Structure formats: C-alpha cells, structure tokens
Design a protein around this ligand. Structure first.
Ligand code: FEC
Ligand code: FEC
Ligand code: FEC
Ligand SMILES: [Fe+3]
Ligand SMILES: [Fe+3]
Ligand SMILES: [Fe+3]
Ligand SMILES: [Fe+3]
Ligand SMILES: [Fe+3]
Ligand SMILES: [Fe+3]
Lengths: 170, 170, 170, 170, 170, 170
C-alpha cells in the first residue's frame, strides 16, 4: 500500500487496541470500587494502579494515532461486567489480559506488515506490561481459589492508598 | 419516602452526575490530543489536568454510590465531539462546565430533599471545582477571541508536561 | 420566631445531639474494655479512638451551646449495653452510627429553619465523621461475618496503643 | 473470703471510685465550658487538663476491674452542678477533690484487707494525683477570694489551648 | 426565574453584603485609630486585624460578583460613628457583627433559592468568621464591664503591631 | 496662628489628602477586579499592590491626624469610575496620581507655613511613592497605546498572586 494506506491500516488496529484499554479502565476501576467497598485494601489499591497503567496505554495509543493523522476512538470495546465476587474478578481479569496480549500480538504483526516500526515498538512495550498484569491476576486468583478466607483475612483492613493524590487542575 | 427509597433516588442523581463526568473525561482528553498535536503545550497540559479532576469526580461519585449500596455506572452521558477547532474547544467546554454546574445544583437539591447531607456536601465541593474549571475555559476562550493568533504564538511550543508520570502497577 | 426563640430551639437539638454523644462515649469505651480484655488490640485501639472522636463531638456541641447562651447537658441519651459479644458490638455500633446520622440530619434541618448557619455547619461536619465511623463498623462487622475466627486470629495479640498518653494536668 | 469474694469486694470499691471519676469528668468539663465562655483561658485550659486526668483514672479503674472479672460501671456518682460562678467552681472542686481523696483512702484499705496489692498501688498513685488537683483548686480559690478582679484581669484573654488536638479516629 | 434573573438577584445581595463590609472596614479602623491613640496596643492590633478580615470579605464578594457578570459596589452601607468611648466601641461592634450575621444568613437563603451553591458557600464561610469576630467583641466587652480599669491597666502600653508591614508596590 | 490654629489648618489638609487616598483605594481595587476578571494577572496584581500602598497612606495620614488631636475622615473624595477598559484604566490612574502629587505638594507648603515639620516630612515621603505609582501607570498606558494586543498577549494568563494572604484576625 502507499503511505496513506499504511497509516490507515495501522490507525485501525491502534484504535482497536485503544478501545480495549478504554474497556479495561472502566472494568478494572469497577472492581476496585467493590474491592474497596469490601475493605480488601491491598487488592483495591493494586487494581486501581493497573487501571492507571491502562489509562497510560489508552493515552499512548491516542498520541501515536494523532502522529499518524487519525482520530482516537472514544468508544470502549465490549460491555463492562459489574457486581463480580472476589474470585470471579481475578479469573475474568486474567482471561482479559491474556486475550489482550493475543490481540495486541496480532496488531503488532499488522504494524510490521505496514512497515511501521515505531507503532510496533509501542505494542511490544505495552504487551510486556500486559504480561505483568496477567501474572498478577493469575497469582491472586490462585491464592483465592487455593486458600480462600485465610488468605483474605490477611487482606482485610489493609491500606488502599495508591500514594499522593493525582496532580489535577484545582 | 423510606430508607431504601431515599438511597435509590440519590444513587440515581449520582449516577447521572457520574455519567456526565465520564463524558467530560473523554471529551476533554480528546481535545488534549488535538491541542498536543497542534503543539499548544500549556493548553494541552491544563486540559489534561482538568480531565484528571473530572476523573477524581467520577471516582468520588462511585465511592459514595457504593456507600449507599448502589452500582456505579460505566456509561458516559452524551456524545463526544471530535475535530473541534481551538476556539470551539473553549466555547463548548465553557458551556459544558456551566451546564454541569446547573445540573449538579439540581442533583444537590434532591440530596437535601432525600435527607442526605453527606452526598449533598460532595456535590457542593465538586461544584466549586467545576466553577474553577468554568472560569478557566472562559478566560482562555476570552484570550483567543480578543487576541487570536498573538496569544497562540505565545503558547506554541510551550511544555506540555503535567508533571511526573502516572503512578501505576508496573 | 424571635431571637431568643430561634436560639432555644437550636440549643435543644444540640443538647439532644450532645446527649447522644455522651452515650456513645460510654457505650464505645465499654466495648473497648471488653475488646482489650479479649486481647484484640487493634479492635480495642480503634474503638477507643472513635470514642475520642465522639468526645470531641460532645465538646464542639457544648461550645456552640455556650455560644447560643445555653447550658450543655450532662446526661447521656439511652442505656449503655454491656457484655455484648464481638459480633454484636459491631452490629449495634453500625446501627447506632446510622441512627445518629439520621438524627443529626434532622437536627440540621431545624438549624436551617431556625436560621442558624453556624450550627448547621457544625452538624454537617460531624455527620461526615459519623459516616467515617459507620463505614468502619460495617467493614469490621463484615470481616467477622465472612471470615469469623480467621480474621480474629489475625487481630489477637496486636498492639492496643492509641499513641502517646493523655496530655493532662499532672 | 475466698478468691472470688476478694475480687468482688475489690471490684465494688473500684466501681465506686470509677463512678466518682465519671462525675468529676462531667463536672470539671462543665466548668471548663463556662470558664472558656468567660474568656478565662488559663483557668479553662487547666480545668480541661484535670478532667482528662480524671478520664485516665476512670480508664485505669475500668481496666483493673476487667482484670478482676468485673463489669465497669457506666453511671456517674451524684449530680452535676451547673452554672457556678468562678468563685464557687474552685470552692466546690476543692471540696470534691478532698472528699475523693478521703473515699479513695478508704477503698485502699479495703484493697489491703482483701489482699490485693495491685489495686492498692493503683489507688495510691491516683490519690497522689488527686492531691495535686486539690492543691491547684485551693490555690485558685484563694487568689479569687483574696484578690478578685485584679487577679482575673491577668487571666482575661489568656490562651486556652491544651496543646495539639486529640488523636482521634478520623 | 431565568439565568440572567438568578444572577442579578444574587449580585444584589452580594453588593449589600459588600456595602456592609465597606462600612465595617471604616468603622473598625476608626476605632483602631482611637484605641491606638489611647495606647491600648493589643486592642488596637486586634481591631485592625478584624478590619483586614472584613477587607478580605469585601474582596471575596467583589470577586464572586465579577464571576456573575456584575459590578462590585463602592459605597458603604450606613454611617461611620466616630468618637465612641472604649465600652461603646465593643458594644456597638458586637451588635454590628450580630446584625451582619443575621443579614448574611438572609442573603444566603436568597442564594439557595436562586440556585447558586457557590455564592451560598461563600456566605457560609464568611458567616463563621463573623462569628469569630462576634465572640471576640463580646469577650472584650465582657472584660471591660466586669473588670473595668483593672483590665485596661493590663492593656495600656502593650504592643500594637499587627506584624510585618503591608506588602505593597513600593 | 496659635498652637491650636496651626494643628487645625494641618489637620484640614491631612483629611483632604486622606479623602483622596480613600478614593484611590476603592478606585484602584475596582480596576483590579476587572483586570483579574480579564485574566491580566500581572496587571491585576500590581494594581492591588498599589491600592495597598494607598491603604498605608490613608493609615499614616489618620495616625498623624490623631497625634494632632483631630478626627480622621471616613469619606472618600470624589466618585469612583467603574467599568473602564484596560487603556482607560491607566490613562485615568496616571492623571489621578499626577493630580494627587500636585495637591499634596500644596498641602506640604501649608504644613511648612503652619510650622509643622513632622507632617511635612510625611507628605514628602508619600509624594515620592506617588511619583513611583505615576511612573508605573504611565509606562503601562504607553505599552498599551503603542503596542496593543501583542503586549497584552504576554500579560494574559500570568499569575496574579500578591504573595501570602493578609494576616487577619481569624
Ligand atoms: C477514577 C478514574 C477514572 C474513572 C474510571 C471508572 O470507570 O470509574 C479515570 C478514567 C480515565 C479514562 C476513561 C481515561 C482515558 C482518556 C482517553 O484516552 O480518552 C483516563 C486517562 C488517564 N488517567 Fe484516569 N482516565 N486517572 C485517575 C483516575 C481515574 N481515571 C487518577 C487517580 C489518575 C492519577 C495518575 C497520576 O497522577 O499518576 C489518573 C490519570 C490518568 C492519566 C495520566 C497518566 C500519565 O500522565 O502518566 C491518563 C492519560
Ligand atoms: C470533651 C470531652 C468529654 C465530655 C465531657 C463533658 O461533660 O462535656 C469526654 C468524656 C470522656 C468520658 C465520659 C470518658 C470515660 C470513658 C469510660 O470510662 O466510660 C473519657 C475518657 C477518656 N477521654 Fe475524654 N472521656 N477526652 C477528651 C475530651 C472529652 N472526653 C479529649 C480532648 C481527650 C484527648 C486526650 C489526649 O489525646 O491526650 C480525651 C481523652 C480521653 C481518654 C484517653 C486517655 C489516655 O489514653 O491517656 C480517655 C480514657
Ligand atoms: C480588598 C480590600 C479592600 C476593599 C477595596 C475595594 O474597594 O474593594 C480594602 C480596603 C481598605 C480601606 C478602605 C482601608 C482604609 C482604612 C481607613 O483608614 O479607614 C484599608 C486599609 C488597610 N488595608 Fe485594606 N483597606 N488590605 C487588603 C485588602 C483590602 N483592603 C489586604 C489584602 C491587605 C493586606 C496587607 C498585608 O498583609 O501586607 C490590606 C491591608 C490594609 C492595611 C494594612 C497596612 C500595613 O499595616 O502596612 C490598611 C491600613
Ligand atoms: Fe493490562
Ligand atoms: Fe470540571
Ligand atoms: Fe461516631
Ligand atoms: Fe482529681
Ligand atoms: Fe466581622
Ligand atoms: Fe499612589
């Protein structure tokens, strides 16, 4: 394809990935609100920190799309599942991070095929972070399934802070 | 009304307010990508910083909804408009902050009528921030209208940094 | 109503609120002695710390009553229940904080109707603290119900210190 | 008496003393509110600091009672006198601290007779503090009676702070 | 009412409140010149410091009026009374702070009825400061009435400094 | 004239000057509110700092009048002009500072003629500050008239802080 076709194909998968990140942000923050509500502080905090990673992803995809002359999507991909119990949160999140790694690997190939090394490197870096999220999710789901209440007793009442408050406008 | 009644009614205006915040996060960040693309750094920076204020809003609303036994919504209210020109960006955002304020004040009244001092207090606080945001967009909107390209020449190539990067999981 | 009228009516709800705080100080400290006796240190510590918040409440109420020309009551409202078991302690206290909040909100309305913005403000502030207290007791109540003895095993033998001792006269 | 009878007799006088302390706390704080209201800062502050000493007493008696297998009273002993003038505050407080020392000395003897050295040492220590309160009260009542207005002119407008605010829950 | 309507009505009570603050600045400073002339330093100092609080009030009101599209008034409400004797100074100022509070509370109600949460919040804040001022003047008024010249003898020749001088242009 | 006549003539021009300063304070603060509203921060800030200089003047005149046995006026001299545009603010302020220097020089002569060296030195010092204000005003009015929008583009969005907040009573 010519210069314009190669950017358009790339912009396509970038918006595809962006949509997945927009879903993850809403999905992982939804669970954080429950975890926090359940007073599982350490779980609540790390869930929020992973959501903020996905925020950075959505932000990085957007910027790349702009460099390519495209418009970054505002629609999330899929529906958000609410009211999940602690066990189901980690099983579903693990499944999602695995699916996302899978999808992103396929987008990375499209980038290579359109001869776009900068976008490909973006996907490589963000895939490595996705892997770290997947490991985390798998570990927690394991301790929950294999140890139940004894494990959660240690999480009960733990601190949920994610640090100093977000530098905002006001 | 009864207990469950009062709570339900307040959860409802909180979810409306929250849906409004979800929209503003996406609307504002879309403009930030544009402003960052045009290389108006300081404009891009402040836009992003107000979006992060709106994210905190959404969060505070979701936390109060959880306290009332409700489910925090995940759907934004309204459509995000893309491709806006710089002057339209500040004319639309002023209108939105003003509409939001008008709305929140209506929600606030419902909280007083439903006997919920804690939620009304949250609305009062967030409305003053919204006022800080409205003042900001009117001012910029104002400089662009009176000074046009002379003002922009001053913003062109300014730093776009919002400070240290996102404290996340990785 | 007239001046003396408005003041009298507000002094009245303040003395009711204050009597409610006197009860809670005694009720909560009684449970603290129990919790400290069973050697659930962290539970005993936080219980005592909330009682001290209730003491500050009583104080603030008495100071406002004095400002209005009234006499701060010295009688608690209701009877202190002793011998409660750990789960009853957190089920009863949640109910009390919730009832208190319901009450204070009623008192607040009287202050607005009597044109007393300063007293209404004091009620607003103390109601948010009461909400912090209600959230606390529901959480603990929640951990005990879901996790039972596994949770307690984690609290057994923890420090009971509330920090430095009482700054006093001697 | 046997082991149980000796603890019960001790618990009796301990609850007796506790009831006196619960009265003193309400009585001395009542006067503090007046002193503060009268803008006699140094008098107001020291009255509050002595009330907090009595709080510690009520707390120490309670803990000892628990160690003995008893239930710490929640009822104060006697009625609280309100609206006393500056002179009458110090004359009555002196009389009360003297009566309390007298009573406590008699409880101490009961402790010795029940062969309870730990409770006896508690009373000895708390009696020494009561003496310090009595001296203070006597001194102020003396300066008031012997010097009146000139003495109080120096107290007018003095600071009433008792230090940094009480470590609480919120 | 409509937009322009709600704003106009609030601008009106703000300009009344502001005119009241302009009066108090002049009234209070006039007394400060007197008190400074009689060499009651501490009295002169605090009077000036409350006037500066009233200046901040006028400022905050003018800033909110500007936010509503209005013009901040420049005329004080009422006449400044000169030559007052020390006791009249504190009897009149107590009455004024009390009248002001009564007024502001009325203005506040108008803001609620006009749906203006930000202006009502400003009134709420300034009314608590006015209460701090009212408490001050009653206390001093009180010391002068109970203690007369003995109190003044204590103030005579005290420092009149309000701290570092006015950060200005030169 | 005799001792009393010389103080009275001096007090006359001192109240005359004081009245001018009371006008300047209201006039310069009025413009500050507009400049701030226009988001011309550096202009807004310096206008406020010059108003505070005029406050010090009004304060110094008052104190001198008191030393002379007089009563310091509470009436401003003239009417305040509102709603001026940026250009007209600086042209009028320049004219006012020039007129004030002119008037004050004439009052200074009256002081010399009444043989009052202390009041004369006051006028000399305050005249030197007036000169600094006049220079400032002239410079800004020059840049506005000669360079317009390009100059103001640099002022747009600048900080308006005048430093740490005014040491007040509360
Ligand atoms: C809460 C919450 C939501 C709502 C989720 C929900 O469903 O409730 C929420 C929603 C979003 C959404 C959409 C986006 C995506 C924007 C877009 O691309 O359209 C989105 C995007 C971002 N957020 Fe976000 N958020 N958010 C925080 C909280 C929330 N945020 C906190 C706190 C921080 C503070 C981070 C820090 O200071 O380090 C924070 C930071 C960011 C950054 C900045 C990252 C960086 O510069 O490195 C970006 C970009
Ligand atoms: C105010 C007020 C009242 C109500 C009196 C009234 O009649 O208005 C008031 C009432 C009580 C009453 C009952 C008790 C007795 C509890 C019981 O044994 O049932 C009672 C008991 C305690 N108070 Fe209390 N209070 N109180 C403070 C203020 C007030 N307090 C402030 C402030 C501090 C802060 C002290 C500090 O941080 O150093 C503080 C601390 C304590 C401690 C902690 C001592 C320690 O650990 O060394 C105990 C125990
Ligand atoms: C705002 C505002 C107004 C209302 C104007 C308007 O028209 O809106 C306003 C009005 C007045 C008026 C009359 C006077 C004259 C009093 C008289 O002589 O009757 C008047 C007088 C004074 N002000 Fe004033 N003000 N004002 C501030 C703000 C405002 N002030 C801020 C802020 C500071 C803080 C200064 C600092 O901390 O360094 C401050 C300080 C002073 C000092 C203290 C100077 C010194 O001790 O060196 C004097 C005297
Ligand atoms: Fe991820
Ligand atoms: Fe906003
Ligand atoms: Fe509470
Ligand atoms: Fe004592
Ligand atoms: Fe005041
Ligand atoms: Fe000047």
């Amino acid at each position: 394809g010519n210069r314009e076709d190669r950017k358009a194909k790339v912009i396509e998968v970038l918006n595809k990935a962006r949509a997945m990140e927009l879903h993850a942000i809403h999905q992982y923050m939804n669970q954080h609100y429950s975890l926090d509500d359940m007073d599982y502080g350490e779980l609540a905090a790390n869930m929020k920190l992973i959501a903020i990673d996905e925020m950075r992803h959505a932000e990085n995809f957007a910027e790349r799309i702009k460099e390519l002359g495209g418009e970054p999507t505002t629609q999330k991909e899929g529906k958000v599942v609410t009211g999940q119990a602690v066990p189901v949160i980690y099983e579903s999140d693990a499944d999602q991070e695995d699916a996302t790694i899978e999808a992103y690997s396929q987008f990375l190939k499209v980038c290579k095929e359109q001869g776009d090394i900068v976008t490909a490197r973006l996907f490589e870096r963000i895939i490595e972070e996705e892997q770290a999220h997947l490991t985390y999710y798998e570990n927690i789901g394991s301790h929950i399934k294999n140890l139940g209440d004894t494990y959660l007793a240690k999480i009960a009442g733990t601190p949920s802070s994610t640090g100093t408050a977000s530098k905002g406008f006001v």
